[PDB]
Design a protein around this ligand. Structure first.
Ligand SMILES: CCCCCCCCCCCCCCCCCC(=O)OC[C@H](COP(=O)([O-])OCC(O)COP(=O)([O-])OC[C@@H](COC(=O)CCCCCCCCCCCCCCCCC)OC(=O)CCCCCCCCCCCCCCCCC)OC(=O)CCCCCCCCCCCCCCCCC
Ligand SMILES: CCCCCCCCCCCCCCCCCC(=O)OC[C@H](COP(=O)([O-])OCC(O)COP(=O)([O-])OC[C@@H](COC(=O)CCCCCCCCCCCCCCCCC)OC(=O)CCCCCCCCCCCCCCCCC)OC(=O)CCCCCCCCCCCCCCCCC
Ligand SMILES: CCCCCCCCCCCCCCCCCC(=O)OC[C@H](COP(=O)([O-])OCC(O)COP(=O)([O-])OC[C@@H](COC(=O)CCCCCCCCCCCCCCCCC)OC(=O)CCCCCCCCCCCCCCCCC)OC(=O)CCCCCCCCCCCCCCCCC
Ligand SMILES: CCCCCCCCCCCCCCCCC[C@@H](O)O[C@H](CO[C@H](O)CCCCCCCCCCCCCCC)COP(=O)(O)OCC[N+](C)(C)C
Ligand SMILES: CCCCCCCCCCCCCCCCC[C@@H](O)O[C@H](CO[C@H](O)CCCCCCCCCCCCCCC)COP(=O)(O)OCC[N+](C)(C)C
Ligand SMILES: CCCCCCCCCCCCCCCCC[C@@H](O)O[C@H](CO[C@H](O)CCCCCCCCCCCCCCC)COP(=O)(O)OCC[N+](C)(C)C
Ligand SMILES: CCCCCCCC/C=C\CCCCCCCC(=O)OC[C@H](COP(=O)(O)OCCN)OC(=O)CCCCCCC/C=C\CCCCCCCC
Ligand SMILES: CCCCCCCC/C=C\CCCCCCCC(=O)OC[C@H](COP(=O)(O)OCCN)OC(=O)CCCCCCC/C=C\CCCCCCCC
Ligand SMILES: CCCCCCCC/C=C\CCCCCCCC(=O)O[C@H](COC(=O)CCCCCCC/C=C/CCCCCCCC)COP(=O)(O)OCCN
Lengths: 140, 56, 52, 98, 121, 54, 459, 63, 347
């Protein structure tokens, strides 16, 4: 539910790198499990063993991406000594994209994932700073 | 030949008629923005003895 | 959406079954007749937000 | 909220899961639908009788009637499927695809 | 805005009685002329689809299209004007009834207001 | 002319978009038409909305 | 303004009820008559504007563009009269209808006192152009060109709608007068940065900016002649006009948000000028020249100084006329040759001397020769950019030299040299083409006498 | 025509647009307050009518 | 079937929808849904064939599951508050389940899978009725309880619906599947503005109904089901292809055509509630709908595909049956932008 997001957000950005990495790993694992369940439901490959292999690889890939993103972003935030800077989230997103490319083993997916994940992470950080709303409440 | 060229050249009068109609519409639309006629703080003028409006 | 034909015509097609306290046969009372009556009278003609 | 209502909602959820699992035998799908309907009838009857909402005693019967009608309709469709294929396996309905 | 639950509303009235207190749209209204133009376009398209002389196939049919469109446009314009008048009336009544939420702004002059100047170089 | 205008500027904005949308269309529209998988996905999304959005 | 909009509308029933062999005559005559009516708008005053009504207003920025738009249509008809000979009456009438609709949309766009109406017509100008490109196009790549032209524009302009409605929600009005009078500074924030990007990108994509210009060579090459002239002359100026109208609310953010676009334009002018040198096609060469000139206009607008704006307006008008002339000449060559390749037909000056004269005059005007308004706008922008920074002169001078080089290369390859031996269908030039070139060029040499009419509101 | 015509037309147009902008801001604020509180004619979601209640002896004193 | 029986079934479908819209009791609304489903099935099976039977059984299964979920939600709402009137839901679980039930009935993703197949199996006339008329009851019910719906669930389902419709429309070749995905995307657009302003929902519904009625009537007029069968049309009735291309451009959201009115207006409303990211995303997504509409227009009218010899014989015969209201539908779906403020009529 929203408990994992609260766990990730409660930690200060510039401290507790291991806890941030654990929270990001949990979020990535949950997303990987959900996408694996959808893939299994819509495309039953051949049997139980292939299905469990596919769900395991998807969950591991997503968890690795999340862990790398969290660790890199927190490390950059601490080292630069400048929190609330979207540049740290951009570096984290590009690192996550790089691990996605390494897991898929093709340079094109790695570069595209770096670009389009650093951009998304930077946008998320900017929204958190400025209070951008995705699901806006019905004011008027 | 009268009443014969009309059936072939009646289309030429369309554009000038449209122009005249547009001029009339412009004047009529200008008639709706007279809320400050002769009340501007710069062009405030006393009317002539035989003048009713500053501009039309 | 909701075309209130009933209130326009005063037909009462389906309004008798809406609540517990509305003209039960043989005047058999609901188990929570008093509470429902109190809440309905509290929230009548007040609007959804203010009633809540 | 006592345990009886919890058990009835659990039965409805189990029947819904059985309907959505879809092993084979579309007749089993219809059976799952009607199990869901029976759970609905039991729950509504208990709720209405508990609160002495007299005028609402009509609601279950009406419900049942309509639902049974749907069941009949469903059965008809099933029959036609078999008459086109010789059997009612769910996997045979794959002519139309996204 | 959601004026659906506005008190004292007849459930299925196109034009309430109070809507008669507003000036009706002129018969030469530009919007009514636009509805007439839409009717004429519908007539031309109808002639085109049926494979008939587009300009001069059915004069009665084109006239009926124009008249129906003008009729519906007139009534729709009346309803639109009434609804907008209702919205403005509710706005003004609410702003009058709640002076605390709409305080009078302390009118100020540009002479005693400091706006930062950003030179262009 | 060739390397920037005809190769990389084409690869970045239009060609990448075309490739991504083609791949997504192929992924989404490839359904065998089995209602077994459809209703399994329906159950999955019912569970997800029940436990996530509350 | 309705004295202009109404006759343009009446052009449609006039065309559709004309005889089968007299549509061109009527359309040309009444289009020219309309242009004369549009001439009255040019007499602007040093004060605010000619506020006609609540919906339309005219400035000294809108007046030259409006006059050029009204003047272009007769030339488009004379250009299209050639390749539509074997076309049915209904399709020719549909073509003229598309041209008239395009002119009407542009006329309503250029005044558009409210920004949402401006955006609505600014996107409405996209349908007739796409229909013209994809329907009456020769090559098989017209479909891809139409798709590129549609999507490049729409992707950029879609966030603009959101930005505009947001501005209306906060500011409370989108009328340009109120927007100008009540303007307030934009604070340096991420939200304001993205508002700036949304409001700017929609106009920068259409100009086009270097890096987003991929749609322009395709659209210009695959389109028919009339589509080519309307793209190069007027449709490119929509972005610049919108940018000069909308930069009134983006200060002082622009002071540092202009760096990426300034660098992109100041390098893309050099890149496209160099590209023009090594080109196997004429229309592609002219399209890249248009890209270079529009990049210079982008630099001028982003500098945001009075001389920048004056030079931008002058360059807009001059480039429109020059590019239209060049596309006309290329089309006349292609009609006889049927190949559209620069080196396939050579030495045409020996066979067609007057067309060689027209080629020389068009190349000289494109070369920014004094005292033509091309060089007036060029020099104003050069001085303004020099005031902005002393190092821009290097890039601008390099662009000038390369521009001269590729202009004279275009002239020499097609006009000088020995004629190609195996071409024997170079018929003498008709009176229509000579009249078209004369009507293209004479307004330029006439406007060089009264520059103040095209120098914009900051004159 | 003379400059006074354009001058006064512009003044009238400016007044109209300024009034419209102020009215739009007021409308947005009024809508926000009305939806937040619910004490105005707008955003009045229906409730149960109280004319449906039966006020009669119910065969049981305690209702 | 017999014309009298067909008319009776159509009257019963309309009566069920009317009963859903004009009733203030949850049980009566459920009864109206059941009547609609019961009478709608033979309309799909008017032209008997295996494809029609399979489509009808898929539709029946989906609708029956949705109705059972709706009844369970009604039961829970009654349990936690002894109220039958359709008003604030008074319970989160009941609201969630009723939202899923109405999503299943409407066709919003991820419950969208049945729409393309049901539209493909059944005929054009059946498809036209299913695509436009069916939406009126669930949309009315959703509008009646919009103050209780959770914005997160509705907004995410609408976004997913827009994405799925846009992506799935690119691949399809048959016109009926293209229409199904177009309907999915339009409903994703329309249900996103439910929490904010239901008037925009009704306006978008009316505009979409007009556009899809015009397009389906044009497809029936020129009896084409696949893309190539439509490409052959220009050789006989070019006017139909031109009108269809104009309507397709309108359906893509291109101004100044009528199809731009809803999207624009909808965006405006979500900008009043400080929702900026989502309208931008839905616009860039509707670009995909525009793309496949443009591809269809390229195939149909803007280019002349090769014809067939036998088509010569079709030149001599005229369309015997003319469907009334087609010109009106085209005009209303193409040239009604200047009358946008009439949406204040609370249509
Ligand atoms: C910020 C929070 C965290 C981030 C969230 C956002 C991230 C999204 C992740 C998932 C995105 C989905 C699409 C991506 C690619 C498609 C899947 C795929 O096959 O790629 C495999 C591809 C490998 O290629 P391949 O498998 O060999 O190729 C297979 C064949 O070629 C051909 O492949 P195939 O045929 O096997 O395709 C698989 C199959 C199956 O495809 C799918 O599974 C679709 C995925 C949808 C679910 C997305 C998960 C979202 C979870 C939300 C809740 C989160 C809670 C926390 O596709 C289909 O058949 C059609 C499916 C689509 C039709 C409609 C179905 C939609 C159902 C509803 C959608 C979502 C409902 C949510 C609730 C709804 C309630 C109303 O790459 C991967 O392995 C990637 C797997 C997962 C990586 C995700 C990365 C996670 C990053 C998280 C970072 C967090 C940082 C810390 C916080 C800050
Ligand atoms: C602005 C729009 C305004 C009008 C809106 C629609 C109304 C008319 C459309 C119906 C179609 C009829 C037609 O086809 O034309 C044939 C017909 C002439 O040919 P015909 O021998 O009679 O019959 C031939 C057959 O119709 C058929 O001939 P065919 O089959 O042998 O020829 C084949 C041709 C036949 O195909 C067509 O002709 C297509 C018909 C046009 C499509 C209709 C679209 C519906 C409205 C949407 C407009 C969108 C505007 C927004 C901007 C975006 C542009 C897409 O198909 C093709 O060529 C294949 C490719 C088509 C090329 C690309 C298609 C693009 C279409 C987009 C049109 C948009 C502008 C339309 C302007 C009006 C055009 C008629 O045209 C007319 O006579 C009617 C024109 C208007 C009459 C005005 C007379 C009244 C004026 C006198 C009084 C003065 C008024 C002021 C009073 C105050 C003064 C004091
Ligand atoms: C906002 C509202 C949005 C409305 C949503 C869209 C409405 C579309 C559903 C209407 C029904 C569909 C339809 O009529 O065919 C599609 C029809 C296409 O015509 P078609 O393809 O030649 O008809 C083929 C039928 O399958 C050939 O049918 P048939 O061979 O069985 O002929 C029987 C025919 C003849 O009917 C009779 O024989 C009369 C006898 C009365 C018997 C009394 C029994 C009562 C107890 O009756 C009918 O066709 C059905 C009429 C139902 C009455 C509706 C009032 O398109 C439209 O009707 C467009 C309707 C315009 C929009 C609705 C009103 C404007 C707003
Ligand atoms: C020796 C002389 C040398 C100089 C000659 C100069 C001649 C100039 C002719 C060209 C004029 C250009 C067109 C100007 C149009 C803009 C002005 C126009 O819109 O005004 C309209 C009026 O236009 C004229 O009535 C009609 C002029 C149209 C014809 C111009 C002359 C040339 C026409 C040639 C047409 C073809 C000739 C025949 C060919 C076979 C409406 O005026 P209105 O808004 O109410 O004025 C309000 C202010 N009032 C009350 C003081 C008047
Ligand atoms: C490709 C063809 C051309 C397309 C269009 C090109 C133009 C788009 C480029 C965007 C213009 C600039 C964007 C942001 C400018 C702000 C300045 C910022 O970048 O500099 C530093 C910002 O630091 C980092 O840059 C943070 C952002 C990092 C993430 C952004 C992505 C960077 C690379 C992505 C390139 C992709 C571009 C094309 C996308 C498709 C200064 O740090 P700081 O003083 O503290 O913050 C200043 C802002 N404040 C004052 C409001 C707080
Ligand atoms: C293309 C745009 C859609 C066109 C739709 C077809 C047009 C022809 C329809 C013929 C008339 C329609 C209705 C017939 C009049 C009598 C019915 C009347 O009593 O209904 C009233 C209501 O009248 C209708 O709602 C207005 C119909 C007008 C529709 C046109 C608006 C389209 C706006 C944008 C396009 C501009 C028009 C283009 C030319 C038509 C009662 O309202 P009320 O019961 O109290 O509120 C119910 C709604 N709630 C529940 C949400 C509160
Ligand atoms: C915002 C989210 C950002 C997501 C970043 C990842 C997107 C990168 C896509 C760029 C192009 C990818 C590419 O290089 O193409 C090659 C690569 C190889 O093709 P396959 O047949 O699948 O082979 C797999 C085994 N090697 O293609 C792909 O796998 C990617 C295709 C679909 C990517 C779409 C991702 C969209 C994610 C958001 C969906 C909502
Ligand atoms: C969130 C998601 C946002 C989605 C944004 C949608 C962008 C709109 C363009 C999408 C077009 C994708 C369709 C596509 O490319 O299909 C592949 C298609 C195959 O050709 P078909 O005609 O379909 O098949 C015939 C052969 N059998 O490839 C092509 O030929 C492409 C030709 C036209 C390409 C036009 C691309 C122009 C886009 C420019 C950039 C705009 C991108 C919009 C987002 C901007 C970034 C924020
Ligand atoms: C030829 C292809 C060109 C593609 C152009 C696309 C990029 C255009 C630039 C971004 C477009 C989206 C901007 C949003 C529209 C402006 C609205 C606005 O300004 O409101 C902001 C909202 O700002 C945003 O929401 C921006 C979110 C952006 C999400 C979409 C990202 C799209 C891609 C981003 C990177 C692209 C930038 C470079 C593009 C270069 C061209 C490829 C204020 O937020 P408030 O709620 O009022 O907060 C006040 C209280 N603190």
């Amino acid at each position: 539910a929203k408990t994992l997001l609260h766990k990730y957000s409660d930690i200060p950005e510039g401290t507790e790198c291991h806890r941030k990495a654990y929270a990001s790993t949990s979020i990535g694992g949950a997303t990987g499990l959900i996408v694996s369940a959808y893939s299994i439901a819509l495309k039953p490959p051949a049997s139980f063993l292939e299905g469990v292999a596919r769900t395991g690889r998807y969950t591991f890939t997503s968890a690795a991406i999340g862990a790398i993103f969290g660790l890199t972003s927190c490390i950059s935030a601490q080292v630069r000594e400048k929190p609330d800077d979207p540049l740290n989230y951009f570096i984290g997103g590009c690192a996550g994209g790089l691990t996605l490319g390494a897991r898929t083993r093709s340079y094109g997916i790695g570069a595209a994932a770096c670009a389009y994940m650093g951009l998304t992470a930077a946008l998320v950080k900017m929204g958190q700073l400025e209070g951008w709303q995705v699901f806006a409440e019905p004011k008027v | 030949n009268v009443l014969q060229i009309v059936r072939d050249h009646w289309v030429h009068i369309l554009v000038p008629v449209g122009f005249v109609f547009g001029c009339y519409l412009d004047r009529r639309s200008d008639e709706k923005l007279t809320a400050f006629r002769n009340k501007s703080l710069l062009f405030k003028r006393e009317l002539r003895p035989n003048e009713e409006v500053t501009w039309k | 959406p909701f075309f209130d034909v009933q209130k326009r015509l005063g037909l009462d097609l389906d309004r008798w079954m809406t609540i517990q306290s509305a003209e039960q046969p043989h005047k058999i009372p609901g188990r929570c007749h008093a509470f429902e009556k109190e809440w309905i009278e509290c929230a009548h003609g007040i609007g959804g937000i203010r009633a809540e | 909220m006592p345990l009886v209502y919890m058990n009835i909602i659990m039965a409805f959820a189990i029947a819904l899961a059985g309907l959505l699992m879809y092993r084979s035998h579309l007749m089993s799908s219809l059976l799952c639908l009607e199990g869901m309907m029976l759970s609905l009838f039991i729950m509504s009857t208990l709720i209405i009788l508990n609160t002495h909402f007299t005028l609402a005693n009509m609601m279950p019967i009406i419900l049942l009637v309509f639902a049974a009608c749907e069941a009949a309709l469903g059965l008809s469709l099933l029959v036609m499927v078999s008459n086109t294929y010789g059997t009612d396996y769910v996997q045979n309905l794959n002519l139309l695809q996204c | 805005t959601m004026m659906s639950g506005r008190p004292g509303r007849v459930p299925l009235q196109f034009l309430p009685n109070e809507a008669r207190s507003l000036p009706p749209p002129k018969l030469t209204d530009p919007r009514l002329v636009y509805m007439g133009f839409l009717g004429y376009c519908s007539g031309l398209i109808d002639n085109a689809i049926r494979r008939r002389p587009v300009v001069s196939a059915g004069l009665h049919r084109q006239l009926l299209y124009v008249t129906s469109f003008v009729f519906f446009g007139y009534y729709l314009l009346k309803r639109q004007d009434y609804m907008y008048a209702l919205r403005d009336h509710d706005m003004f009544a609410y702003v009058k009834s709640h002076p605390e939420d709409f305080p009078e702004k302390d009118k100020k002059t540009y002479g005693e207001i400091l706006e930062e100047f950003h030179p262009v170089r | 002319s060739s390397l920037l205008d005809l190769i990389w500027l084409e690869t970045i904005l239009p060609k990448t978009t075309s490739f991504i949308q083609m791949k997504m269309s192929i992924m989404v529209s490839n359904q065998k038409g089995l209602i077994k998988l459809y209703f399994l996905s329906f159950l999955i999304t019912i569970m997800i909305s029940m436990t996530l959005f509350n | 303004m309705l004295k202009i909009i109404i006759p343009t509308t009446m052009l449609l029933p006039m065309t559709w009820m004309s005889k089968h062999n007299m549509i061109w005559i009527n359309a040309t005559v009444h289009s020219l008559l309309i242009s004369l009516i549009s001439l009255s708008l040019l007499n602007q005053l040093g004060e605010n504007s000619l506020n006609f009504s609540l919906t339309f207003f005219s400035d000294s920025l809108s007046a030259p563009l409006l006059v050029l738009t009204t003047w272009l249509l007769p030339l488009m008809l004379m250009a299209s009269q050639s390749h539509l000979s074997k076309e049915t009456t209904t399709r020719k009438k549909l073509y003229i209808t598309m041209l008239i609709l395009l002119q009407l949309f542009l006329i309503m766009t250029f005044t558009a006192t409210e920004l949402i109406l401006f955006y609505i017509l600014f996107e409405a100008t996209l349908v007739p152009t796409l229909i013209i490109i994809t329907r009456w196009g020769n090559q098989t790549e017209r479909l891809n060109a139409g798709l590129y032209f549609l999507f490049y524009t729409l992707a950029g302009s879609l966030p603009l709608l959101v930005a505009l409605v947001y501005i209306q929600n906060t500011t409370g009005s989108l009328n340009f007068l109120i927007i100008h009078y009540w303007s307030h500074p934009l604070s340096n924030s991420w939200s304001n940065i993205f508002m700036w990007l949304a409001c700017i990108m929609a106009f920068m994509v259409k100009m086009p900016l270097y890096g987003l210009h991929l749609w322009l060579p395709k659209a210009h090459v695959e389109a028919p002649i009339a589509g080519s002239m309307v793209l190069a002359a007027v449709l490119l100026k929509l972005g610049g006009y919108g940018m000069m109208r909308i930069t009134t609310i983006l200060n002082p953010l622009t002071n540092y948000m202009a760096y990426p676009f300034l660098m992109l334009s100041m390098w893309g002018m050099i890149m496209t000028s160099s590209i023009c040198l090594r080109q196997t096609d004429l229309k592609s060469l002219i399209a890249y020249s248009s890209v270079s000139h529009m990049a210079l206009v982008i630099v001028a607008i982003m500098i945001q100084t009075p001389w920048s704006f004056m030079g931008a307006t002058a360059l807009m008008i001059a480039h429109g006329l020059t590019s239209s002339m060049l596309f006309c000449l290329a089309n006349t060559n292609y009609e006889r040759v049927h190949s559209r390749t620069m080196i396939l037909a050579r030495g045409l000056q020996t066979l067609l001397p007057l067309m060689a004269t027209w080629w020389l005059v068009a190349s000289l005007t494109n070369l920014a020769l004094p005292p033509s308004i091309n060089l007036i706008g060029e020099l104003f922008i050069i001085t303004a950019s020099f005031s902005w920074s002393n190092i821009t002169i290097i890039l601008m001078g390099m662009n000038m030299m390369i521009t001269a080089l590729y202009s004279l290369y275009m002239l020499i390859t097609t006009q000088r040299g020995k004629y190609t031996h195996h071409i024997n269908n170079i018929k003498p030039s008709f009176t229509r083409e000579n009249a078209l070139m004369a009507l293209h060029i004479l307004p330029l040499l006439l406007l060089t006498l009264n520059p103040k009419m095209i120098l914009g509101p900051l004159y | 025509d003379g400059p006074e015509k354009n001058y006064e037309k512009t003044m009238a147009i400016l007044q109209i647009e300024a009034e419209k902008a102020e009215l739009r801001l007021k409308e947005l604020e009024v809508r926000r307050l009305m939806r937040a509180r619910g004490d105005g004619p707008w955003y009045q979601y229906p409730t149960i009518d109280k004319a449906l209640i039966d006020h009669s002896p119910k065969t049981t004193p305690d209702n | 079937m017999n014309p009298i029986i067909y008319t009776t079934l159509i009257m019963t479908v309309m009566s069920g929808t009317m009963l859903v819209m004009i009733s203030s009791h949850w049980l009566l609304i459920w009864i109206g849904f059941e009547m609609n489903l019961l009478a709608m099935i033979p309309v799909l099976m008017k032209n008997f064939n295996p494809r029609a039977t399979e489509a009808a059984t898929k539709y029946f299964l989906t609708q029956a599951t949705a109705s059972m979920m709706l009844m369970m939600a009604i039961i829970i709402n009654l349990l936690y508050s002894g109220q039958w009137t359709i008003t604030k839901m008074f319970n989160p679980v009941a609201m969630t389940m009723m939202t899923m039930a109405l999503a299943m009935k409407l066709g919003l993703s991820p419950f969208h899978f049945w729409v393309p197949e049901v539209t493909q199996g059944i005929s054009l006339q059946a498809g036209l009725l299913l695509l436009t008329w069916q939406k009126l009851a669930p949309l009315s019910v959703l509008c009646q309880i919009s103050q209780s719906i959770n914005p997160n669930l509705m907004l995410t389902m609408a976004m997913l619906s827009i994405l799925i419709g846009g992506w799935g429309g690119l691949n399809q070749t048959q016109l009926r599947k293209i229409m199904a995905y177009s309907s999915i995307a339009h409903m994703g657009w329309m249900t996103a503005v439910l929490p904010y302003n239901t008037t925009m929902t009704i306006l978008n519904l009316l505009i979409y109904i007009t556009m899809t009625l015009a397009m389906f009537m044009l497809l029936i007029h020129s009896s084409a089901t696949t893309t190539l069968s439509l490409s052959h049309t220009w050789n006989k009735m070019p006017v139909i292809t031109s009108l269809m291309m104009v309507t397709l451009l309108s359906m893509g959201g291109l101004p100044p055509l009528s199809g731009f009115m809803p999207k624009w207006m909808i965006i405006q409303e979500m900008t009043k509630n400080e929702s900026i990211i989502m309208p931008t995303l839905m616009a860039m997504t509707a670009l995909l709908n525009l793309y496949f509409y443009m591809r269809l227009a390229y195939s149909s009218s803007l280019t002349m595909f090769p014809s067939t010899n036998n088509m010569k014989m079709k030149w001599q015969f005229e369309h015997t049956k003319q469907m009334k209201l087609l010109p009106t539908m085209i005009v209303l779906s193409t040239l009604v932008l200047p009358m946008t403020p009439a949406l204040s009529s609370l249509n």
